[PDB]
């Protein structure tokens, strides 16, 4: 089965094509991860996935989505990830991390605590920053402060320092969070970027923050470890053909700038959209980005059955299949997929203390 | 659903009727558990089971099954369990432990490393002890040393010391391992016990080691925490009616000795048997023990589907359903069962960072 073929990118070899995409846990305190994350990540890595990308980890305190978000804005924050890196590697998986800045969608409650912007009377909140002083709307009404040129320099340096820390902590795969309506995506989109300086207006200017951040990270991230990004390539806002064409052109520039793989997603920049949710619906879009930009890709949002994942690889729509929620339901989902796809010795997707007995359960 | 009704025994309340029975991991070193066990147990506890009984933990070095078995024969060994106890509790499950002595089945290889008695030239092996100098046979040919009265006194004290260490580590539930052909079971069975002293021959004599060990443990284990045992009530050796009658009588004497619940199993004392493996095959046997000995029971060996578990509880065959291998396959099996049985808010079997999203997946 294609899902269980290894994948090599730079010096990193994944044992199969199953990637666990970044999934915020909202369980950190002051950015510091803890026993929640340690067990959560170690268990999923033992489940068999070849790559585990750690959740959106803020490059700066105001770049957290919520008060429960992980951070990597100090060396002490980075050192807290070391046992997670070690547990993922000990399980035979590859440890990655998504480094992030939530932009105008920051200072929000946890999803099971309202999911909305923290009110001004709640001392847990903080001022948000963005390309322009314009709110997302809906449940995120807080108007962000428009970034200064010094803010732009500072946030870029925060991404550099976050990448340096991720490198030194032993991560073997990095993903820049340029998707999902957060800071990077909001620089690209004309919905959110009304700037009149070098960072807004034209395609070159809207791309500039993302390309400059990529280039700055490229200087500190090892050439032999995959340098990746997540990017929303369309919004389902009635502008899809033009937006996809521009996003694919930006992907070409990412490739020229040393990007090794693109996690293809939806922008989620504004709420006034009509996303056609369905099984594997991103398949054709990821395939178009992969083929037209000539870059390996992953995607998510409905590939979480063994046959859907296998079909996407066979059709050369994806290079890795990201499977998120199914791994929250079952940390050993990779083993479940190996069984369903008839992999020889499927139980040995898991470590010996499980595999021995489940082979004989069979 | 009966499977998701709470259960109270002494001062302990389990949130549902799903118990994870003891399952050796073979990953300890010199009896000390480590990060294998920490993640393994914490992840299963977060999966939703109401009770998690930690694997057979040796009361003495020679009572391990294998060089990978956990031990609790010193205070340092007990302290290693504290983070496991606390992680199970933090997940909302109840931490138990099975304390054990492998008897003539000790000094064996891990199951995926031959599963057989360690060879005499292998430096990892040790001298085994048993009621009588008689080998199990088959893949376990080593002849054990017949225990003296001094050995009997010492092993009993080892069980006492282990129970006191388990108490201080914070376990809320203890299970004495009198099953599966190990030391306790082998004192009961005429196949393995040929003694001519007070500990062999008659039913009273064969029961004596088990009753005296239970009574000695009772003096140090808190009256307000469940005191349980696992015991093989038949062998499938052509002597089932007589053996089950004797085993049920011993269960009555365990109850008179303060036992709160019996984990009903098969003896596995000798290899020359014909065990009729099948779904829920222990149901009728556990029901007979429960009704005739008037004692709460659990059992295992084929209850690991949601409907089989539910049916056994509704028929009053069991008070708790032990589900072992299904939790190695999926450490969130309790959530899978809640979904299959149509429990309201089934996703909230899991902690919020999973439950919130799986409710909406639905
Ligand atoms: C709990 C949760 C947290 C998420 N956090 C992140 C995140 O930190 N970064 C990110 O890029 N996507 C995040 N996402 C989106 C997922 O990576 C993924 O795209 C989504 O779950 C769809 O894939 P699936 O259908 O396999 O679940 C998150 C999704 C969930 C359910
Ligand atoms: C890996 C493994 C380890 C086990 N270790 C123990 C043990 O330490 N003590 C015990 O009493 N039973 C042990 N058993 C037997 C189980 O507790 C249980 O009775 C068996 O797995 C049957 O239940 P199931 O059909 O739900 O798996 C073990 C079983 C397995 C698969
Ligand atoms: C068998 C492979 O798994 C392991 O050894 C492990 N984590 O995966 C540890 C720390 O014991
Ligand atoms: C809905 C698009 O945004 C995401 O997927 C996300 N992070 O990227 C979270 C934490 O929800
Ligand atoms: C029929 C069950 O066989 C097993 O796997 C087992 N436990 O589950 C053993 C041998 O310990
Ligand atoms: C909200 C549930 O969180 C937990 O269960 C936990 N351990 O289990 C923590 C706080 O780390
Ligand atoms: C075959 C019966 O033995 C067991 O289940 C056991 N412990 O009790 C193991 C395999 O470790
Ligand atoms: C509640 C819907 O869950 C999702 O689709 C999701 N990821 O899978 C989000 C919003 O991040």
Numbering used by the authors:
A (entry chain B), B (entry chain A): 2 to 363
From the reporting publication:
The biocatalytic reduction of the oxime moiety to the corresponding amine group has only recently been found to be a promiscuous activity of ene-reductases transforming α-oximo β-keto esters. By studying the crystal structures of enzyme oxime complexes, analyzing molecular dynamics simulations, and investigating biocatalytic cascades and possible intermediates, we obtained evidence that the reaction proceeds via an imine intermediate and not via the hydroxylamine intermediate. To gain more insight into the reaction pathway, we determined the crystal structures of the two enzymes OPR3 and XenA in complex with the oxime substrates 1a–c, either by co-crystallization or by soaking. All the crystal structures obtained had a high resolution (1.9–1.35 Å) and showed clear electron density features for the oximes.
To assess if the introduced amino acid exchanges affected the overall structure and the binding of the oxime, we also crystallized the tyrosine variants in complex with selected oxime substrates. The protomers in the crystal structures of the tyrosine variants are perfectly superimposable with the ones of the wild-type enzymes, confirming that the exchanges did not lead to major structural alterations. Interestingly, the binding mode of the oxime substrates also did not change in most of the structures. The propanoyl moiety of oxime 1b points into this cavity and is likely stabilized by hydrophobic interactions. Substrates with an acetyl moiety (such as oximes 1a and 1c) give the non-productive binding mode described above. Tyrosine 183, the canonical proton donor of XenA,55 is also found at a hydrogen bond distance from the Cα of the oxime. Looking at the results obtained for XenA, product formation was comparable for both tyrosine variants, the canonical Y183F and the non-canonical one (Y27F). The calculated high Kd for oxime 1b clearly indicates this enzyme’s low affinity for the substrate and might explain why this enzyme performed poorly in the biotransformation of the other oximes in our previous work. Both the Y183F and the Y27F variants of XenA showed a non-Michaelis–Menten behavior, with a linear increase of the rate over the concentration (bottom right).
